[PDB]
């Protein structure tokens with residue numbers, strides 16, 4: 035057991051059915067999220083289209099944390115049926131998934147001082163609304179109001195950093211959203227790792243029209259977080275002719291986070307906003323080495339576009355929560371041990387059952403480097419030092 | 423200098439303006455390729471849309487072989503300006519780019535025994551025709567006729583293996599194109615590393631309707647080659663608001679097409695059903711291999727039911743790779759086996775080696791006999 039509490043940068047709640055409706059402008063009652071029932075099952079119907087990002091939006095019954103961990107690692111014994119790995123429980127047996135007081139008490143048992151609390155259902159909504167910019171902005175605001183109500187962006191006990199969503203789909207309205215969440219004390223905001231929807235056409239994350247948003251975050255010392263989402267990448271499997279076809283995930287994997295970080299870096303977001311901090315959550319860290327190779331090639335062939343070294347921008351401005359099976363010594367060699375974050379993804383089935391068991395993956399590190407990975411790097415990410 | 427002649431699996435001709443029209447029936451005169459001119463420049467106009475795969479389809483002036491080496495490796499020296507690199511000569515001064523006799527004499531000077539001769543313009547046509555299945559199949563047939571005429575799939579001197587194109591867009595017609603080229607002695611065919619266009623929707627390379635084509639190639643011992651092409655991957659840049667080049671575009675494209683092509687072949691069981699089928703990757707690099715292996719292993723662990731064989735072993739057994747000059751070649755041999763590494767110069771392209779045999783400069787970490795595998799013998803195994 036560690037001698038200090040940890041800071042877990044990847045935790046989830048399970049949204050109640052009204053997370054996107056409780057505070058939604060009635061103008062968007064059909065344009066946004068609706069929960070409709072066939073009598074047995076509830077379906078999320080988003081802009082009049084049934085959405086399938088979450089198989090059961092009631093979240094009951096609910097997967098056992100970590101039951102898919104050995105699977106996602108490949109550690110699964112021979113002849114064993116993967117369907118047999120999934121175990122579920124009654125949602126009411128786990129109030130800590132939806133209730134802040136219950137969650138804090140579980141955090142105490144888990145030895146977590148501060149958890150970043152991130153959406154589950156909410157990570158699929160923006161792709162569903164990508165053709166309705168006004169419904170996107172209203173729905174993100176409704177969600178953020180719900181989030182601050184049930185979880186709180188950062189209540190005075192400083193146990194939970196609940197990250198609201200910022201959509202850049204309407205960049206003027208986005209500056210209003212950022213001002214609103216910053217005024218309510220947000221310490222981390224999530225932007226989807228995907229092309230930004232547009233009225234006319236989609237935009238790069240580094241579009242100059244987004245500069246006012248990045249400037250607000252950078253001046254506030256609040257990082258942008260990029261968490262695994264529906265980023266619309268099934269379009270690749272679609273181009274290839276695409277109950278799970280095994281090809282789809284091979285074609286998808288970690289391409290969204292790679293392309294997101296490329297968009298940010300190549301289009302000069304960190305050049306224009308050198309104080310801006312970013313963090314990748316639940317996207318793995320395998321993307322880094324290909325991204326570094328490709329950035330080096332781009333900077334060499336078009337040096338005029340790279341007044342600064344894009345690899346150093348990656349190393350300076352970006353923190354990464356790796357997957358448990360990633361080569362962590364190698365990652366530290368590449369991005370620096372100070373940029374590696376512990377995140378458990380609790381209570382998801384693909385996450386760790388016991389968050390602090392992440393330390394089993396750190397036997398290659400000194401006691402003081404483990405303290406950085408398990409606690410202090412996250413505090414560095416959130417903070418801005420007076421000396422910087 | 424080596425004491426054997428080499429086998430170069432990546433060489434090009436430059437198509438004359440009529441490669442896709444000489445033997446094309448008039449019914450496809452507008453649906454296929456036309457060369458239309460504005461008084462100064464000539465443009466490839468494909469299915470009534472101006473195409474931009476090749477900057478100048480007359481190929482005159484013509485790039486100096488190897489002058490873009492530094493650029494394609496991102497080894498442009500400190501201080502050197504990128505656009506100062508391109509040098510051009512006149513096409514008339516290099517008949518070996520379009521004339522078989524002149525090319526043989528140049529191969530003698532280069533110490534190449536056999537060259538795989540591959541398209542330049544031809545690698546962009548299929549994407550342009552992906553919405554017209556009949557025009558695709560007819561245009562590929564017309565081109566294959568032109569190829570056998572000017573270069574010959576495999577003339578008696580056995581100096582040149584000129585690979586015809588096979589499109590799977592109409593699978594029945596594809597089987598018939600395979601028979602056509604095989605009967606004329608083809609020893610390698612090119613399939614585009616890209617989704618296969620369909621009347622109704624695109625298909626995986628491993629779609630079951632493609633089995634008769636793979637079966638015929640596997641039984642004949644003729645490999646399928648996948649050469650760098652317009653595979654339509656600019657759609658990813660497009661999704662990001664893309665499409666002076668925007669430097670993001672190429673970061674988002676890179677080697678994704680060959681990765682996804684090999685994934686489609688292996689995951690959908692082409693090598694499971696056709697274990698004798700040989701494939702070769704040409705001008706796509708070899709960096710894709712490590713991520714592909716990672717992802718194939720994950721897929722096999724997650725859905726073992728779909729993977730009765732080890733997909734990484736299928737990669738290693740059935741696939742040959744001509745890597746980029748600058749790739750880590752000892753590492754590649756550690757991963758796929760030295761027997762699967764092929765020398766290819768990409769001559770005379772600008773991004774290729776000016777001197778094909780200089781490829782050996784990157785092989786100092788290998789034994790004399792392994793260099794012989796890479797520069798000659800592995801290609802003989804691939805062909806059979």
Ligand SMILES: [Cl-]
Pocket residue numbers: 252253306307308309310
């Ligand atoms: Cl700044």
Ligand SMILES: [Cl-]
Pocket residue numbers: 651652653654655656679
């Ligand atoms: Cl492409």
Ligand SMILES: [Cl-]
Pocket residue numbers: 640641695696697698699
């Ligand atoms: Cl077979």
Ligand SMILES: [Cl-]
Pocket residue numbers: 494495746747748749
């Ligand atoms: Cl290279």
Ligand SMILES: [Mg+2]
Pocket residue numbers: 738739758759
């Ligand atoms: Mg082997």
